[PDB]
mmCIF file of N, CA and C in Angstrom:
data_model
loop_
_atom_site.group_PDB
_atom_site.id
_atom_site.type_symbol
_atom_site.label_atom_id
_atom_site.label_comp_id
_atom_site.label_asym_id
_atom_site.label_seq_id
_atom_site.Cartn_x
_atom_site.Cartn_y
_atom_site.Cartn_z
ATOM 1 N N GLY Z 662 -7.309 6.290 5.734
ATOM 2 C CA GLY Z 662 -6.558 7.302 4.315
ATOM 3 C C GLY Z 662 -6.603 8.682 4.533
ATOM 4 N N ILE Z 663 -5.248 8.281 3.885
ATOM 5 C CA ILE Z 663 -4.938 10.586 3.166
ATOM 6 C C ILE Z 663 -5.427 11.230 3.104
ATOM 7 N N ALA Z 664 -6.392 11.135 2.574
ATOM 8 C CA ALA Z 664 -7.620 11.736 1.724
ATOM 9 C C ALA Z 664 -8.210 12.307 2.821
ATOM 10 N N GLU Z 665 -8.347 12.174 3.882
ATOM 11 C CA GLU Z 665 -9.081 12.146 5.154
ATOM 12 C C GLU Z 665 -8.603 13.394 5.963
ATOM 13 N N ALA Z 666 -6.273 13.233 5.986
ATOM 14 C CA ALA Z 666 -5.687 14.720 6.412
ATOM 15 C C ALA Z 666 -5.871 15.358 5.307
ATOM 16 N N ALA Z 667 -5.371 15.447 4.378
ATOM 17 C CA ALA Z 667 -5.969 16.351 2.848
ATOM 18 C C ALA Z 667 -6.710 16.185 1.983
ATOM 19 N N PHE Z 668 -8.019 16.853 2.050
ATOM 20 C CA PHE Z 668 -9.300 16.915 0.646
ATOM 21 C C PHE Z 668 -8.869 16.552 0.100
ATOM 22 N N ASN Z 669 -9.660 15.612 -0.713
ATOM 23 C CA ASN Z 669 -8.896 15.912 -1.968
ATOM 24 C C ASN Z 669 -11.326 14.876 -2.880
ATOM 25 N N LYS Z 670 -10.946 15.675 -4.212
ATOM 26 C CA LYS Z 670 -11.989 15.565 -4.484
ATOM 27 C C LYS Z 670 -12.412 13.853 -5.027
ATOM 28 N N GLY Z 671 -11.316 13.601 -5.543
ATOM 29 C CA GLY Z 671 -11.205 11.730 -5.579
ATOM 30 C C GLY Z 671 -11.471 10.804 -4.943
ATOM 31 N N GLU Z 672 -11.591 9.735 -4.957
ATOM 32 C CA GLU Z 672 -12.159 8.765 -3.322
ATOM 33 C C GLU Z 672 -11.043 8.821 -2.898
ATOM 34 N N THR Z 673 -11.773 8.151 -1.407
ATOM 35 C CA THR Z 673 -10.697 8.811 -0.313
ATOM 36 C C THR Z 673 -10.169 7.448 -0.185
ATOM 37 N N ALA Z 674 -9.022 8.056 -0.838
ATOM 38 C CA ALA Z 674 -7.375 7.148 -0.902
ATOM 39 C C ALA Z 674 -6.571 6.369 0.432
ATOM 40 N N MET Z 675 -6.129 5.618 0.358
ATOM 41 C CA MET Z 675 -5.716 5.348 1.811
ATOM 42 C C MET Z 675 -4.253 5.665 2.042
ATOM 43 N N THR Z 676 -4.063 5.759 3.121
ATOM 44 C CA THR Z 676 -2.310 6.252 3.009
ATOM 45 C C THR Z 676 -1.538 5.834 2.257
ATOM 46 N N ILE Z 677 -0.593 7.487 1.711
ATOM 47 C CA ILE Z 677 0.366 7.065 0.824
ATOM 48 C C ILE Z 677 1.844 6.092 0.773
ATOM 49 N N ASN Z 678 1.866 5.072 -0.261
ATOM 50 C CA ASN Z 678 3.068 4.373 -0.212
ATOM 51 C C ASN Z 678 3.778 5.309 -0.604
ATOM 52 N N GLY Z 679 5.356 5.369 -0.223
ATOM 53 C CA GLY Z 679 6.779 5.531 -0.003
ATOM 54 C C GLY Z 679 7.256 6.049 -1.850
ATOM 55 N N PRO Z 680 7.758 4.553 -2.054
ATOM 56 C CA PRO Z 680 7.450 4.678 -3.282
ATOM 57 C C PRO Z 680 6.798 5.290 -4.366
ATOM 58 N N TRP Z 681 6.648 6.069 -5.043
ATOM 59 C CA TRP Z 681 5.810 7.069 -5.776
ATOM 60 C C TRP Z 681 5.691 6.560 -7.615
ATOM 61 N N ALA Z 682 4.053 6.641 -7.590
ATOM 62 C CA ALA Z 682 3.336 5.974 -9.074
ATOM 63 C C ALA Z 682 3.837 7.277 -10.194
ATOM 64 N N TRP Z 683 5.001 7.733 -10.445
ATOM 65 C CA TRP Z 683 5.218 8.153 -11.851
ATOM 66 C C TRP Z 683 4.211 8.155 -12.949
ATOM 67 N N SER Z 684 4.009 6.639 -13.026
ATOM 68 C CA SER Z 684 3.292 6.752 -14.298
ATOM 69 C C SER Z 684 1.817 6.109 -13.658
ATOM 70 N N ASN Z 685 0.979 6.829 -13.642
ATOM 71 C CA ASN Z 685 -0.721 7.536 -13.705
ATOM 72 C C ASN Z 685 -1.715 6.589 -14.359
ATOM 73 N N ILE Z 686 -2.914 7.104 -14.029
ATOM 74 C CA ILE Z 686 -3.841 6.386 -15.317
ATOM 75 C C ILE Z 686 -3.631 6.961 -16.650
ATOM 76 N N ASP Z 687 -3.234 8.587 -16.975
ATOM 77 C CA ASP Z 687 -3.486 8.778 -18.328
ATOM 78 C C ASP Z 687 -2.320 7.114 -19.001
ATOM 79 N N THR Z 688 -1.410 6.706 -18.155
ATOM 80 C CA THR Z 688 -1.427 5.490 -19.564
ATOM 81 C C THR Z 688 -1.597 3.948 -18.561
ATOM 82 N N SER Z 689 -2.803 4.598 -18.252
ATOM 83 C CA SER Z 689 -3.827 2.999 -17.507
ATOM 84 C C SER Z 689 -2.956 2.708 -16.397
ATOM 85 N N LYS Z 690 -2.495 3.492 -16.272
ATOM 86 C CA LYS Z 690 -1.327 2.297 -15.034
ATOM 87 C C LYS Z 690 -2.067 2.121 -13.335
ATOM 88 N N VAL Z 691 -2.310 3.721 -12.738
ATOM 89 C CA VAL Z 691 -2.962 3.511 -11.587
ATOM 90 C C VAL Z 691 -4.494 3.262 -11.649
ATOM 91 N N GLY Z 692 -4.897 3.648 -10.276
ATOM 92 C CA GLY Z 692 -6.735 3.912 -10.614
ATOM 93 C C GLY Z 692 -6.994 5.814 -10.650
ATOM 94 N N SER Z 693 -7.684 5.872 -9.860
ATOM 95 C CA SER Z 693 -8.107 7.561 -10.555
ATOM 96 C C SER Z 693 -7.167 8.633 -9.526
ATOM 97 N N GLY Z 694 -6.161 8.392 -10.084
ATOM 98 C CA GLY Z 694 -4.681 9.757 -9.240
ATOM 99 C C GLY Z 694 -5.013 10.829 -9.438
ATOM 100 N N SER Z 695 -5.533 11.353 -10.748
ATOM 101 C CA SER Z 695 -6.100 12.736 -11.650
ATOM 102 C C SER Z 695 -6.391 13.733 -10.745
ATOM 103 N N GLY Z 696 -4.947 14.356 -10.149
ATOM 104 C CA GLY Z 696 -5.800 15.875 -9.115
ATOM 105 C C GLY Z 696 -4.248 16.102 -8.733
ATOM 106 N N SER Z 697 -4.462 17.703 -8.770
ATOM 107 C CA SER Z 697 -3.301 17.840 -7.575
ATOM 108 C C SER Z 697 -3.328 18.264 -6.568
ATOM 109 N N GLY Z 698 -4.890 17.792 -5.733
ATOM 110 C CA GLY Z 698 -5.620 17.989 -4.201
ATOM 111 C C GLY Z 698 -5.212 19.991 -3.901
ATOM 112 N N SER Z 699 -6.925 19.899 -3.027
ATOM 113 C CA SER Z 699 -7.125 21.009 -2.742
ATOM 114 C C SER Z 699 -7.558 21.241 -0.824
ATOM 115 N N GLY Z 700 -6.370 21.197 -0.281
ATOM 116 C CA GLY Z 700 -6.717 20.815 1.169
ATOM 117 C C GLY Z 700 -6.060 21.627 1.632
ATOM 118 N N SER Z 701 -5.952 22.089 3.106
ATOM 119 C CA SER Z 701 -5.405 23.275 3.780
ATOM 120 C C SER Z 701 -4.794 22.389 4.878
ATOM 121 N N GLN Z 702 -3.384 22.618 5.077
ATOM 122 C CA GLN Z 702 -1.990 22.702 6.290
ATOM 123 C C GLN Z 702 -2.733 22.847 7.711
ATOM 124 N N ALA Z 703 -1.646 21.916 8.493
ATOM 125 C CA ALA Z 703 -1.812 22.652 10.088
ATOM 126 C C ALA Z 703 -0.648 23.455 10.253
ATOM 127 N N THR Z 704 -0.650 24.046 11.015
ATOM 128 C CA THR Z 704 0.454 24.529 11.328
ATOM 129 C C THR Z 704 1.580 24.309 11.712
ATOM 130 N N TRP Z 705 2.389 25.099 10.910
ATOM 131 C CA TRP Z 705 3.875 24.411 12.140
ATOM 132 C C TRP Z 705 4.501 25.556 12.965
ATOM 133 N N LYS Z 706 5.040 24.754 13.705
ATOM 134 C CA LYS Z 706 6.477 26.104 14.477
ATOM 135 C C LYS Z 706 7.743 25.736 13.419
ATOM 136 N N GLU Z 707 8.679 27.119 14.003
ATOM 137 C CA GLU Z 707 10.560 26.454 13.413
ATOM 138 C C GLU Z 707 10.886 25.261 15.156
ATOM 139 N N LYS Z 708 11.888 24.490 14.605
ATOM 140 C CA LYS Z 708 12.999 23.775 15.215
ATOM 141 C C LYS Z 708 14.130 24.242 15.174
ATOM 142 N N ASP Z 709 14.629 24.354 16.501
ATOM 143 C CA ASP Z 709 16.030 25.048 16.718
ATOM 144 C C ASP Z 709 17.131 23.730 16.578
ATOM 145 N N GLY Z 710 18.099 24.159 16.351
ATOM 146 C CA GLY Z 710 19.266 23.188 16.351
ATOM 147 C C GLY Z 710 18.980 22.467 15.125
ATOM 148 N N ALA Z 711 18.935 21.255 15.148
ATOM 149 C CA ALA Z 711 18.882 19.816 14.893
ATOM 150 C C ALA Z 711 17.617 19.326 14.783
ATOM 151 N N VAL Z 712 16.987 18.509 13.030
ATOM 152 C CA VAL Z 712 16.160 17.687 13.321
ATOM 153 C C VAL Z 712 15.982 16.221 14.110
ATOM 154 N N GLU Z 713 15.306 15.837 14.757
ATOM 155 C CA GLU Z 713 15.267 14.340 15.854
ATOM 156 C C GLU Z 713 14.809 13.616 15.340
ATOM 157 N N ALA Z 714 14.575 12.099 16.135
ATOM 158 C CA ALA Z 714 14.217 11.064 15.445
ATOM 159 C C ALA Z 714 12.839 11.001 14.864
ATOM 160 N N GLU Z 715 12.095 12.526 16.545
ATOM 161 C CA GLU Z 715 10.446 12.063 16.033
ATOM 162 C C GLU Z 715 10.262 13.354 15.090
ATOM 163 N N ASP Z 716 10.966 14.354 15.177
ATOM 164 C CA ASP Z 716 10.561 15.724 14.273
ATOM 165 C C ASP Z 716 10.524 15.818 13.281
ATOM 166 N N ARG Z 717 9.345 16.245 12.639
ATOM 167 C CA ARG Z 717 8.695 17.129 11.543
ATOM 168 C C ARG Z 717 10.253 18.519 10.642
ATOM 169 N N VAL Z 718 9.946 18.181 9.808
ATOM 170 C CA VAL Z 718 11.074 19.807 8.525
ATOM 171 C C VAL Z 718 10.539 19.916 6.947
ATOM 172 N N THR Z 719 9.585 20.697 6.681
ATOM 173 C CA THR Z 719 9.838 20.760 5.199
ATOM 174 C C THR Z 719 11.336 20.586 4.730
ATOM 175 N N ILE Z 720 10.928 19.356 3.899
ATOM 176 C CA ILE Z 720 12.308 19.289 3.435
ATOM 177 C C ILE Z 720 11.615 19.792 1.442
ATOM 178 N N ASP Z 721 13.182 19.648 0.812
ATOM 179 C CA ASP Z 721 12.947 19.807 -0.799
ATOM 180 C C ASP Z 721 13.570 18.787 -1.133
ATOM 181 N N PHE Z 722 13.259 17.833 -2.349
ATOM 182 C CA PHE Z 722 14.092 16.730 -2.766
ATOM 183 C C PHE Z 722 13.890 16.481 -4.706
ATOM 184 N N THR Z 723 14.674 16.016 -5.323
ATOM 185 C CA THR Z 723 15.139 16.197 -6.865
ATOM 186 C C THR Z 723 16.367 15.501 -6.935
ATOM 187 N N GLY Z 724 16.758 14.697 -8.162
ATOM 188 C CA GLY Z 724 17.714 14.172 -8.483
ATOM 189 C C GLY Z 724 17.460 13.291 -9.063
ATOM 190 N N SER Z 725 18.491 12.263 -9.251
ATOM 191 C CA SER Z 725 18.319 11.336 -10.127
ATOM 192 C C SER Z 725 18.201 10.356 -8.605
ATOM 193 N N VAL Z 726 18.162 9.114 -9.649
ATOM 194 C CA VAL Z 726 18.045 6.951 -9.461
ATOM 195 C C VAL Z 726 18.942 6.516 -10.228
ATOM 196 N N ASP Z 727 20.076 6.342 -9.461
ATOM 197 C CA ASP Z 727 21.130 5.082 -10.160
ATOM 198 C C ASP Z 727 21.637 6.231 -11.536
ATOM 199 N N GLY Z 728 21.814 7.296 -11.399
ATOM 200 C CA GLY Z 728 22.250 8.493 -12.423
ATOM 201 C C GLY Z 728 21.339 8.473 -13.176
ATOM 202 N N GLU Z 729 19.637 7.817 -13.378
ATOM 203 C CA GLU Z 729 18.446 7.401 -14.042
ATOM 204 C C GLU Z 729 17.704 9.427 -13.624
ATOM 205 N N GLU Z 730 17.610 10.079 -14.430
ATOM 206 C CA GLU Z 730 16.140 11.206 -14.205
ATOM 207 C C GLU Z 730 15.064 10.465 -14.591
ATOM 208 N N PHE Z 731 14.299 10.629 -12.944
ATOM 209 C CA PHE Z 731 12.856 10.121 -12.835
ATOM 210 C C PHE Z 731 12.183 11.279 -13.115
ATOM 211 N N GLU Z 732 11.540 12.299 -14.061
ATOM 212 C CA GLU Z 732 10.406 13.184 -13.644
ATOM 213 C C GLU Z 732 8.900 13.218 -13.520
ATOM 214 N N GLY Z 733 8.550 13.042 -12.622
ATOM 215 C CA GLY Z 733 7.520 12.853 -11.828
ATOM 216 C C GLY Z 733 7.122 12.196 -10.410
ATOM 217 N N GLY Z 734 8.938 11.856 -9.767
ATOM 218 C CA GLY Z 734 9.320 12.076 -8.572
ATOM 219 C C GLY Z 734 10.372 13.072 -7.650
ATOM 220 N N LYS Z 735 9.396 14.297 -7.760
ATOM 221 C CA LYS Z 735 10.532 14.821 -6.646
ATOM 222 C C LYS Z 735 9.142 16.263 -6.456
ATOM 223 N N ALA Z 736 9.376 16.498 -4.968
ATOM 224 C CA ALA Z 736 8.564 17.697 -4.844
ATOM 225 C C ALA Z 736 9.888 18.804 -4.127
ATOM 226 N N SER Z 737 8.831 20.060 -4.052
ATOM 227 C CA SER Z 737 9.506 21.146 -3.432
ATOM 228 C C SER Z 737 8.563 20.919 -1.854
ATOM 229 N N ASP Z 738 9.580 22.128 -1.094
ATOM 230 C CA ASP Z 738 8.540 22.378 -0.059
ATOM 231 C C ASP Z 738 7.774 21.691 1.028
ATOM 232 N N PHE Z 739 8.264 19.553 0.584
ATOM 233 C CA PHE Z 739 7.190 19.322 0.806
ATOM 234 C C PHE Z 739 7.197 18.562 3.188
ATOM 235 N N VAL Z 740 6.706 18.706 3.552
ATOM 236 C CA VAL Z 740 6.114 18.897 4.611
ATOM 237 C C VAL Z 740 6.142 17.089 5.159
ATOM 238 N N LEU Z 741 7.907 17.330 5.676
ATOM 239 C CA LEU Z 741 7.680 15.670 5.930
ATOM 240 C C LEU Z 741 8.327 15.215 7.416
ATOM 241 N N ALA Z 742 6.655 14.456 7.333
ATOM 242 C CA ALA Z 742 7.330 13.562 8.941
ATOM 243 C C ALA Z 742 8.068 12.411 9.154
ATOM 244 N N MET Z 743 8.915 12.122 9.782
ATOM 245 C CA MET Z 743 10.023 11.175 9.182
ATOM 246 C C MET Z 743 9.376 10.046 9.754
ATOM 247 N N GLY Z 744 10.493 8.888 9.372
ATOM 248 C CA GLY Z 744 10.016 7.652 9.934
ATOM 249 C C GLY Z 744 8.855 7.023 9.866
ATOM 250 N N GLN Z 745 7.875 7.388 8.781
ATOM 251 C CA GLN Z 745 6.565 6.813 8.720
ATOM 252 C C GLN Z 745 6.627 7.073 7.408
ATOM 253 N N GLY Z 746 4.875 5.297 7.378
ATOM 254 C CA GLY Z 746 5.614 4.505 6.254
ATOM 255 C C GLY Z 746 4.442 4.679 5.480
ATOM 256 N N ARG Z 747 4.487 6.087 5.298
ATOM 257 C CA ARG Z 747 3.966 6.323 3.731
ATOM 258 C C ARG Z 747 4.573 7.271 3.154
ATOM 259 N N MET Z 748 6.149 7.886 3.904
ATOM 260 C CA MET Z 748 7.133 7.972 3.036
ATOM 261 C C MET Z 748 8.239 6.695 2.682
ATOM 262 N N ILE Z 749 9.127 7.094 1.855
ATOM 263 C CA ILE Z 749 10.404 6.022 1.715
ATOM 264 C C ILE Z 749 10.255 5.536 2.757
ATOM 265 N N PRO Z 750 11.776 4.062 3.147
ATOM 266 C CA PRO Z 750 12.389 3.534 4.453
ATOM 267 C C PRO Z 750 13.906 4.844 4.125
ATOM 268 N N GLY Z 751 14.217 5.488 3.136
ATOM 269 C CA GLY Z 751 14.769 6.153 3.180
ATOM 270 C C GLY Z 751 14.984 7.248 4.426
ATOM 271 N N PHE Z 752 13.940 7.998 4.516
ATOM 272 C CA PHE Z 752 13.334 8.935 5.760
ATOM 273 C C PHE Z 752 13.146 8.559 7.199
ATOM 274 N N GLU Z 753 13.800 7.154 7.130
ATOM 275 C CA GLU Z 753 14.104 6.666 8.519
ATOM 276 C C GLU Z 753 15.520 8.016 8.970
ATOM 277 N N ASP Z 754 16.374 8.490 8.009
ATOM 278 C CA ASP Z 754 17.507 9.488 8.700
ATOM 279 C C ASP Z 754 17.491 10.861 7.211
ATOM 280 N N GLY Z 755 18.359 10.445 6.761
ATOM 281 C CA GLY Z 755 18.464 11.528 5.536
ATOM 282 C C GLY Z 755 18.000 13.312 6.663
ATOM 283 N N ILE Z 756 16.912 13.435 6.924
ATOM 284 C CA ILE Z 756 17.153 15.411 7.479
ATOM 285 C C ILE Z 756 17.831 14.890 9.368
ATOM 286 N N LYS Z 757 18.125 13.480 9.974
ATOM 287 C CA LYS Z 757 18.503 13.908 10.759
ATOM 288 C C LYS Z 757 19.907 14.279 11.549
ATOM 289 N N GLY Z 758 20.040 14.405 12.972
ATOM 290 C CA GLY Z 758 21.066 15.223 13.532
ATOM 291 C C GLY Z 758 21.998 16.230 12.238
ATOM 292 N N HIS Z 759 20.926 17.034 11.928
ATOM 293 C CA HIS Z 759 21.563 18.382 11.200
ATOM 294 C C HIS Z 759 20.365 19.169 11.269
ATOM 295 N N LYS Z 760 20.548 20.433 10.804
ATOM 296 C CA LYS Z 760 19.512 22.023 10.805
ATOM 297 C C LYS Z 760 19.209 22.021 8.910
ATOM 298 N N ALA Z 761 18.575 22.625 8.943
ATOM 299 C CA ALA Z 761 17.980 23.417 7.759
ATOM 300 C C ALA Z 761 18.465 24.603 7.203
ATOM 301 N N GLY Z 762 18.207 25.045 6.141
ATOM 302 C CA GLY Z 762 18.926 25.874 5.424
ATOM 303 C C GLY Z 762 20.740 25.329 4.596
ATOM 304 N N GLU Z 763 21.306 24.404 5.001
ATOM 305 C CA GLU Z 763 22.463 23.996 4.216
ATOM 306 C C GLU Z 763 21.994 22.367 3.320
ATOM 307 N N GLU Z 764 22.383 22.685 2.651
ATOM 308 C CA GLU Z 764 23.254 22.412 1.595
ATOM 309 C C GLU Z 764 24.015 20.363 1.639
ATOM 310 N N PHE Z 765 22.995 19.312 1.316
ATOM 311 C CA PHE Z 765 23.481 17.602 0.657
ATOM 312 C C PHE Z 765 23.297 17.377 0.156
ATOM 313 N N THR Z 766 23.976 16.158 0.536
ATOM 314 C CA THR Z 766 23.298 14.130 -0.496
ATOM 315 C C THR Z 766 23.125 13.900 0.202
ATOM 316 N N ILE Z 767 22.021 12.108 0.271
ATOM 317 C CA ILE Z 767 21.741 12.081 0.362
ATOM 318 C C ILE Z 767 20.762 10.290 -0.614
ATOM 319 N N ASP Z 768 21.255 8.889 -0.321
ATOM 320 C CA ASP Z 768 21.455 8.030 -1.651
ATOM 321 C C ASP Z 768 20.561 6.928 -0.276
ATOM 322 N N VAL Z 769 19.088 7.482 -0.871
ATOM 323 C CA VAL Z 769 17.508 6.088 -0.299
ATOM 324 C C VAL Z 769 17.512 5.474 -1.036
ATOM 325 N N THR Z 770 17.189 4.217 -1.248
ATOM 326 C CA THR Z 770 16.787 2.598 -1.262
ATOM 327 C C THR Z 770 15.711 2.686 -1.668
ATOM 328 N N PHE Z 771 14.800 3.255 -3.297
ATOM 329 C CA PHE Z 771 13.545 2.627 -3.001
ATOM 330 C C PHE Z 771 13.239 0.683 -2.637
ATOM 331 N N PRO Z 772 12.214 0.487 -2.033
ATOM 332 C CA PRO Z 772 11.506 0.005 -1.749
ATOM 333 C C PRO Z 772 11.033 -1.533 -3.408
ATOM 334 N N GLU Z 773 10.807 -2.490 -2.909
ATOM 335 C CA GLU Z 773 10.781 -3.619 -2.991
ATOM 336 C C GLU Z 773 9.174 -3.847 -3.815
ATOM 337 N N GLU Z 774 8.453 -2.305 -2.382
ATOM 338 C CA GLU Z 774 7.421 -2.582 -3.047
ATOM 339 C C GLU Z 774 7.120 -1.534 -4.306
ATOM 340 N N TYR Z 775 7.856 -0.547 -4.283
ATOM 341 C CA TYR Z 775 7.514 -0.423 -5.852
ATOM 342 C C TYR Z 775 6.631 -0.375 -7.268
ATOM 343 N N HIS Z 776 5.705 0.478 -6.624
ATOM 344 C CA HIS Z 776 3.885 0.084 -8.147
ATOM 345 C C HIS Z 776 4.615 0.741 -9.456
ATOM 346 N N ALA Z 777 6.057 0.972 -9.671
ATOM 347 C CA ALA Z 777 6.480 1.124 -11.176
ATOM 348 C C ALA Z 777 6.980 0.672 -11.685
ATOM 349 N N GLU Z 778 6.865 0.853 -13.515
ATOM 350 C CA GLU Z 778 7.403 0.457 -14.256
ATOM 351 C C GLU Z 778 8.997 0.310 -14.569
ATOM 352 N N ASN Z 779 9.961 1.141 -14.213
ATOM 353 C CA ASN Z 779 11.113 1.694 -14.559
ATOM 354 C C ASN Z 779 11.771 1.560 -13.406
ATOM 355 N N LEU Z 780 10.653 2.118 -12.716
ATOM 356 C CA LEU Z 780 11.683 2.455 -10.985
ATOM 357 C C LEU Z 780 11.052 1.090 -10.085
ATOM 358 N N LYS Z 781 12.274 0.402 -10.555
ATOM 359 C CA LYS Z 781 11.331 -0.968 -9.582
ATOM 360 C C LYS Z 781 13.042 -1.076 -8.094
ATOM 361 N N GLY Z 782 12.771 -1.123 -6.617
ATOM 362 C CA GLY Z 782 13.818 -1.325 -6.010
ATOM 363 C C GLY Z 782 15.118 -0.588 -5.711
ATOM 364 N N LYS Z 783 15.475 0.304 -6.693
ATOM 365 C CA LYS Z 783 16.534 1.338 -7.015
ATOM 366 C C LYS Z 783 16.695 1.501 -6.113
ATOM 367 N N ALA Z 784 17.721 2.518 -6.230
ATOM 368 C CA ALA Z 784 18.375 4.100 -4.803
ATOM 369 C C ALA Z 784 19.051 4.763 -5.155
ATOM 370 N N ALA Z 785 17.985 5.885 -4.697
ATOM 371 C CA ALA Z 785 18.207 7.492 -5.688
ATOM 372 C C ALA Z 785 19.168 8.608 -4.436
ATOM 373 N N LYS Z 786 19.186 9.124 -5.418
ATOM 374 C CA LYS Z 786 20.260 9.903 -4.514
ATOM 375 C C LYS Z 786 19.440 11.718 -5.116
ATOM 376 N N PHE Z 787 19.511 12.479 -3.644
ATOM 377 C CA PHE Z 787 18.733 14.307 -3.752
ATOM 378 C C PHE Z 787 20.270 14.475 -2.637
ATOM 379 N N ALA Z 788 20.559 15.592 -4.032
ATOM 380 C CA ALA Z 788 21.457 16.647 -4.079
ATOM 381 C C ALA Z 788 20.629 17.866 -3.950
ATOM 382 N N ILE Z 789 20.178 18.387 -2.600
ATOM 383 C CA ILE Z 789 19.134 18.888 -2.600
ATOM 384 C C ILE Z 789 19.543 19.927 -1.090
ATOM 385 N N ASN Z 790 19.170 20.904 -0.833
ATOM 386 C CA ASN Z 790 19.432 22.042 0.608
ATOM 387 C C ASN Z 790 17.584 21.849 1.166
ATOM 388 N N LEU Z 791 17.955 21.402 2.594
ATOM 389 C CA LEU Z 791 16.770 20.851 3.206
ATOM 390 C C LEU Z 791 16.174 22.576 3.151
ATOM 391 N N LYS Z 792 14.773 22.821 3.206
ATOM 392 C CA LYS Z 792 13.770 23.954 2.908
ATOM 393 C C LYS Z 792 13.641 24.692 3.685
ATOM 394 N N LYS Z 793 13.135 24.339 5.603
ATOM 395 C CA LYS Z 793 13.502 24.299 5.938
ATOM 396 C C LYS Z 793 12.416 23.761 7.217
ATOM 397 N N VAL Z 794 13.128 24.021 8.661
ATOM 398 C CA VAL Z 794 12.072 23.587 9.846
ATOM 399 C C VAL Z 794 11.672 24.123 10.580
ATOM 400 N N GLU Z 795 11.140 25.224 9.288
ATOM 401 C CA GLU Z 795 9.883 26.310 10.161
ATOM 402 C C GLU Z 795 8.503 25.694 9.071
ATOM 403 N N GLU Z 796 7.762 26.950 9.570
ATOM 404 C CA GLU Z 796 5.829 26.529 8.494
ATOM 405 C C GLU Z 796 6.396 26.096 7.434
ATOM 406 N N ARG Z 797 5.333 25.747 6.452
ATOM 407 C CA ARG Z 797 4.768 26.156 4.800
ATOM 408 C C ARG Z 797 3.785 25.283 4.568
ATOM 409 N N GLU Z 798 2.407 26.176 5.789
ATOM 410 C CA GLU Z 798 1.678 25.671 5.046
ATOM 411 C C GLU Z 798 0.981 26.252 4.181
ATOM 412 N N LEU Z 799 1.146 25.749 2.769
ATOM 413 C CA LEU Z 799 0.208 26.055 1.203
ATOM 414 C C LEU Z 799 1.021 26.612 0.598
ATOM 415 N N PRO Z 800 2.275 25.969 0.805
ATOM 416 C CA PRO Z 800 3.513 26.490 -0.251
ATOM 417 C C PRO Z 800 3.294 26.741 -1.965
ATOM 418 N N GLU Z 801 3.332 27.763 -1.946
ATOM 419 C CA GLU Z 801 3.633 28.240 -3.854
ATOM 420 C C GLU Z 801 4.660 29.242 -3.535
ATOM 421 N N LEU Z 802 4.494 30.256 -5.123
ATOM 422 C CA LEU Z 802 5.488 31.183 -5.485
ATOM 423 C C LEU Z 802 5.202 32.150 -4.864
ATOM 424 N N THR Z 803 6.112 32.696 -4.021
ATOM 425 C CA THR Z 803 6.689 33.354 -2.699
ATOM 426 C C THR Z 803 7.341 34.531 -3.370
#
């Protein structure tokens, strides 16, 4: 489970599903997912040139989904290993064949596995700069 990778005080939660549940146990939707997470990251090094099909990059993502602004479903300085079942099938590409520091738009389709109410199988678009191909262990207000 992902709770082993990142130290969580909640129950040993299995590997994250790509489509993120904005609607929480406050709405009585998901189980006990009340937590910001307090762990530590493994150390990263800078990637030269472009991001590869196997390579990891610290991304950033925020925007709308089919023109609808979805609050809850965004993350800054997110440390993305691509082509992982933990993340959406949109991250099969999006970062590939280009560098960080540049700003771009990518449209990614959320799967039919989406465990949310308003959000179901619809495509999102992230018009945002790729954060860094470098390290970003425990990113905060720097």
